[PDB]
Amino acid sequence: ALIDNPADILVIAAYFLLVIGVGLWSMRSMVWWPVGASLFASNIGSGHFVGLAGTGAASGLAVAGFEWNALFVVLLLGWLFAPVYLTAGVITMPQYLRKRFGGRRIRLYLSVLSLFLYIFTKISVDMFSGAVFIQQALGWNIYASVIALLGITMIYTVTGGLAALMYTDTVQTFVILGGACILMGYAFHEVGGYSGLFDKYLGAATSLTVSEDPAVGNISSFCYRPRPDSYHLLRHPVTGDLPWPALLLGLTIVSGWYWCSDQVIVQRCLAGKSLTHIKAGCILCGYLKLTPMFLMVMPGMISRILYPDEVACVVPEVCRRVCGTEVGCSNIAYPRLVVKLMPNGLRGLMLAVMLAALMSSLASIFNSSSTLFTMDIYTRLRPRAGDRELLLVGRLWVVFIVVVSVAWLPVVQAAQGGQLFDYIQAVSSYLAPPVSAVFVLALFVPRVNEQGAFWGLIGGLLMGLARLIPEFSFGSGSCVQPSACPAFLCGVHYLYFAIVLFFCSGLLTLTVSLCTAPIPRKHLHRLVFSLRHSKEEREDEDISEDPSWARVVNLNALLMMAVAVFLWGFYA
């Protein structure tokens, strides 16, 4: 209804025909700057736009600390974990944990956990973000939007989009980033510049604050006013919506796990020609990860200023009309902006490129999850299976995960008060800390063994499910309509649960390892941090970097850290 003009239609059609044509033509080598660009592109998706703009609208700029935390963990990736992967001779984290502990149940568990994280944090998130963009662009309901998104993704994957991805992934993401720069310019022009945003944001509230529902009635100002600390990164340790101790400590765990264990992130990182190129690309990626504050978060705050009745809706029936869920409509923040600030030419291009990146992400995750299920899960249940059977099983798995993610769509839509980024970060905080703790203990504690690692993973899974399952079964609740969750199971912030779960699963790992047999030295050479410089052979790839460029790249990590530390204190 908004892109229903000749210019937007022409640009969308031309871009989709271009992607189809590039897909039809498609039918350790990288250097530092493609490495950094690829890391940034792999991390940044349309779910990031939706979530970061939505949380900027709902709560202010503290969510920027979610991206700004990533600089230091990307440094951890370049300086600590990429060397571990190269020294071990492995390309994934499951491969490292198979070499480090042996067995086959740790890898099987990690494959199952990765499948669940694909469904929850990747497939349903991308489907929901595409649906939100399509609903804001066309007025369609979320189910029609998701069916159309799946159909265009099917066209895209039957037309060789997987083959064209290896060329166009990073380029497409950075075209999206240029479009986001243009939209940031338009948005800051709408509010009167950078200082206009901070003039206006605290005064931006909806005037529709009374519900016809007798239970709700007049909504309190606390539920519809902007937070008094909206302009602050570091929020109150207990009453803050993003408490600073949580954001500083427990986000490191979850970010650590993302950057240092993600198969795609590590594969992009390990493609560097040398380790110096890997570290320089990590520096570039970290520098790039300061941009979502101004490209997504602040535009979301601007969207709250511009559309307070829609973005900052507070009465449940109004919110249900605005976006489909009664818990709030901050997720429409970035889409609406794209739909209403971009002109008749750039709006269609921005939507088309965002949706094509969506489609690529979906197709990539579909393929990766299907291969993961076929190789790590299905071939264990059926040891010897034919090629045709594996193809059929992969296709049926894609069908199954699509159905499950469509069923999970209302949950993603309503979760965390209708805040997508909080949903992603909460699921990650419930499922990642066990893996982070086990990986850290594997690196730095040689005494940790297969028993300890596996039972730490299982105990962490149980402890994280004891919070995740009640958090989703007690439903979605907002400030207006609080959920019945007993407030010791949901009132602690999910990044505090990240810390607790990390240390409890690590404690379980250590306790089980100490009461079980240890792994002799001969198996651990170049697999634990204590033996990374061990030339001895082991039982069950180049770390060298030129000293001249090693000092150059190290000072550039210090300079990047100082820039990020300035920005943390600037917006504190």
Binding site: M561, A562, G569
Partner: peptide, 30 residues
């Protein structure tokens, strides 16, 4: 009552002192 740039410079100074400690320890003993 510090300005945002004052807070940024204070954070940078604290970070540089911390890095100076983490380098001087190595300069003394690994």
């Amino acid at each position: 009552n510090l300005q945002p740039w004052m807070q940024g410079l204070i954070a940078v100074a604290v970070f540089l002192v911390l890095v100076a400690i983490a380098f001087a320890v190595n300069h003394f003993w690994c």
